[PDB]
Symmetry: D2
Subunit: 116 residues, 4 copies
């Protein structure tokens, strides 16, 4: 799994479940092309977005739909989404975990990058 | 000053100085229009971006050029930039501070929304 | 003012007001001696803790009563308090700001160390 | 495993390996009694600290030896350690993950608490 996303809820001390995630890849015309999407599981994790073959070098954007998460719980949060933008695979294939820690008016995001 | 941006460096324990910041407002055609920009000061702060009269309700994006900041320090970073996307809401008087705390492979952002 | 403490609330997007803060200095017998204390202001800040003359090199602990803060808001928290432990080092002129960003089940703390 | 500790390095975008962790439990005389200890693995995780039987209700302190981690890499960091203090098991047995995200002048800590 070369790309995994993990989301935690800092209010509840729990995984953030059923969070929508959209991944985009910058195209030759400098527009964001849809690449993959999915929803976090009961563990707060989203696996199976892509494959080593498909996950070529490029500039990627991981959009985490934080507003929809908080609104579904009755909280009116500050941000629309959390966006994570990065170059991937430019020194060869790596495995990326993009983690996010959510609060209604704050979030954190960390990348853990390993060479398989 | 309804909108201020503050950037901190978690590696050095210091304000993040001379960081480029760009603000965009979403236009009716769903594109991001340049709105304001500047560079953080010696205190890590960027004031003077906008006025009460100009800062109307709408969806804004604050882009913080993190990659350039790390490169100037000789440090290899993960993200292309940090992006903060939010709706400005009139609800009695409100000042917005968008704070960011930067590490090479992680950042946090918090909105501090106050009434003078 | 060589030592300032600043506390932010990531749930409400606000300064954390009226938070008790206690500072201790490690004594020769390896016990924590009360040093300074106070409550954060309407801006989330606590100034006036110490002076240049009193704040000598040594190991300090800043204890932030987070649990009481959450309880006053009717919110159930995880931590008993947040603790920040560090050595103060004379190395030319230095001011220390200990910042904390609070959520019920998570906190961050950052040291911003500057020269006037 | 009712208590697990996970540490990440925000500079490198990697698990924090070989980080020493000491756990204490508050005793009847209000002193911190040693409870368990260990070092993070190559995954940044520390498993096997305790058992359901031994991990009774109480106030626990998890001390993460962050200074020794950074110094072993040639970085002179700000904090002595990161301390996480919390009541555990007071509504019955839970599983606790204490995560920490480290930078030289900043850290974050989150608890994920699940009911088995």
């Amino acid at each position: 799994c070369p790309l995994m996303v993990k989301v935690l809820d800092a209010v509840r001390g729990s995984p953030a479940i059923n969070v929508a995630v959209h991944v985009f890849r910058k195209a030759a015309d400098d527009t964001w092309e849809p690449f993959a999407s999915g929803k976090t599981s009961e563990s707060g994790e989203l696996h199976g977005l892509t494959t080593e073959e498909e996950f070529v070098e490029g500039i990627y954007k991981v959009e985490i739909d934080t507003k929809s998460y908080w609104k579904a719980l009755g909280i009116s949060p500050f941000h629309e989404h959390a966006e994570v933008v990065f170059t991937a695979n430019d020194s060869g294939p790596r495995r990326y975990t993009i983690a996010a820690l959510l609060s209604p008016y704050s979030y954190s995001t960390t990348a853990v990058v390993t060479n398989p």
